[model samples]
Target chain A: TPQDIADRERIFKRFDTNGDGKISSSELGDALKTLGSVTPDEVRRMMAEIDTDGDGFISFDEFTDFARANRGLVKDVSKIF
Target chain B: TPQDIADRERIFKRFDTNGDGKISSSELGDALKTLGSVTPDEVRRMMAEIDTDGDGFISFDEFTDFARANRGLVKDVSKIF
Candidate 1:
């Protein structure tokens, strides 16, 4: 379980690139840019999707829950941008 | 984005077996059990980890956040059980 928690912590740190606790839309765009071309619509769409509390950013807790469900951890919780 | 949201809804329905708004640890265990050998300890560990509000269950919002980070939507946001 520690391994699992440690992994999220590490990943969160990587995405929260400015060393802020929250991941901004800019940071998400920056992190995803190297992978593929992304539109402001798509990037903002992702932020709106992930910013569950309407806080306008991705908190560590927010990121963790998002990560788990998409990774197929609990069956059918898979396939998403 | 609609496809992504639809996918999460589908996945959430699958995991929230009881059709309740929340995914109990029991439901999570049942959902995960078919995937791999999992302990009650592990199930509850996941619940505690995902239940960000101390609600003892996984809300849709919580599940969404957990899914994305684990799905590698952002660079380096990968790897976990």
Candidate 2:
């Protein structure tokens, strides 16, 4: 399970480009870019979908939820960002 | 994403060994064994941790929660089982 925690930390770090410990909408957009061309509107939609507390940013836990919910679309860790 | 939904269905099928739409303690034990040897006590503990409803079984949503909580330990779709 420690490996799992470490992996999460790594993924979070990749997305939290500013090292702010949170994924801003812009950061999320960059991460989603790995999937394909993602519009700002689409990124907004995604942020709204995952930002359960309406904090305008995604926590690692929120990203984890989205990741799990969209597992098939993100099979590899590298695919995540 | 539809692909993510499909991946989850595939994983649910793998753990729901009897096609019962739910994972009993025994089934969870079988699934956890993929990671390493798991004792009955450990299986029970896992079930309790994941079974939010206290229904004595794990629904797909519950399993999803567990999977997300331990993402690094469960990267490949095939590794779920």
Candidate 3:
């Protein structure tokens, strides 16, 4: 549903606390902490896994990619129609 | 986080209803119906858009590609550590 798209945006925004349109390693660490116990090293590893462009931060597109890869969920585009 | 990986597999299983390890047009139609209304023509168009190899069926990789395109997402394979 399109609502799911909206929700995805919301989730990204929540994780991107700095509102720079990117999720820094620290921001991801803080968010993941709420999801489960994770050490700084673990967070760095996760970031390394997702920061595909060597940017040292996860763009919204990069984070979404990580999410899709982890969740294996497809987007429902019919809502757009 | 790894649980999300397992969940993705579960989802693909649900979509691959015939256990054929592939999502045929009919299977995708059935799954989409549960989410929203979609016409036969629309399904064909969607399949055509996704069946990049012209196989007339959506492979997991092709479906994943469609999913990423729709959501403006990228894969998290870090180009540089």
DockQ of each: 0.07, 0.02, 0.03
Question: If both were scored by DockQ, which would come out higher, candidate 1 or candidate 3?
Answer: 1
Tell me the tens digit of each residue's lDDT in model 2 across B4-81.
556545655665677756544444445434433333554455445556788665444554565575453334322211
How does model 2 score on DockQ? 0.02
User: What fraction of native interface contacts is shared by candidate 1?
Assistant: 0.10
TM-score of chain B of each: 0.44, 0.45, 0.41
Ranking by lDDT: 1, 2, 3
Measured by TM-score, how close is model 3 to the native structure?
0.27
For model 1, residues A2-79, the per-residue Cα lDDT tens digits are 555555566666656777465544444344343243334444545555556865544445544774554543232342
* Full candidate order by DockQ, most accurate first: 1, 3, 2
Candidate of highest TM-score: 1
Candidates ranked, most accurate by TM-score first = 1, 2, 3
For each candidate in turn, the TM-score is 0.31, 0.29, 0.27
Q: What's the lDDT for all of these models?
A: 0.49, 0.49, 0.47
Q: What lDDT tens digits, residue by residue, belong to model 2 across residues A24-71?
A: 445544443443333344345444554667766444455456556654
| DockQ, computed on Cα atoms, for candidate 3 | 0.03
Instruction: Quote the lDDT for A67 in model 2.
Output: 55
